[PDB]
Amino acid sequence: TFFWLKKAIITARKEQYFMPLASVTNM
Amino acid sequence: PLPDPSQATKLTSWKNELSLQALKADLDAAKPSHTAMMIKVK
Amino acid sequence: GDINKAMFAIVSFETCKADLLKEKDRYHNLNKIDWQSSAPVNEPDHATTTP
């Protein structure tokens, strides 16, 4: 009795600035 | 660091170039029909 | 109702950096790209079989 739209509303991913800066050392 | 995406730069020497916003506007205009069609395929 | 009369056509495909570097002169403006953000998880409209 009510048409149901399929594509649902989705939020994006919050931008992150501190992680790209850090370098990684293997342990 | 982190250079800014969408920093404007002219790629070609054409008198009138497209720029990204025109193409994305065309895509967003054409999308609703495609979304309606895909329901039947699903 | 005719494919030839279409003004535009848009396709989305998965690719890697090595594919773009195969033809270096063909593609410009590669450094500004944020590789980490543009992943199949972040794009919900793309339909794919990759986990």
Q: What is the resolution of this structure in A?
A: 4.0
Is residue B26 packed enough to be buried (19+ CB in 10 Å), middle (13-18) or exposed (0-12)? middle
Contact between residue C42 and residue A13 where contact means Cβ atoms under 8 Å apart = yes
Q: Which residue has the tokens 């920093």?
A: B7
CB contact under 8 A, A10 and C36: no
| B4 at C interface, C-beta within 8 A | yes
C36 lies within 8 A of chain A by CB: yes
Report d(CA C43, CA A17) in Å as an integer: 20
Q: Which of C10, C28, C32 comes nearest B3 by C-beta?
A: C32
B5 vs B38: CA distance, rounded Å: 32
Q: Please state the φ and ψ torsions of residue C19, each to the nearest 5 degrees.
A: -60, -45
How far apart (Å, rounded) are the C-alpha atoms in residues A4 and A6? Answer: 6
What method did the depositors use to determine the structure? cryo-EM
Rg from Cα positions in chain B: 16
A20/B contact by beta carbon, under 8 A: yes
Cβ atoms of C47 and A7 within 8 Å: the answer is no
SS3 for C6?
coil
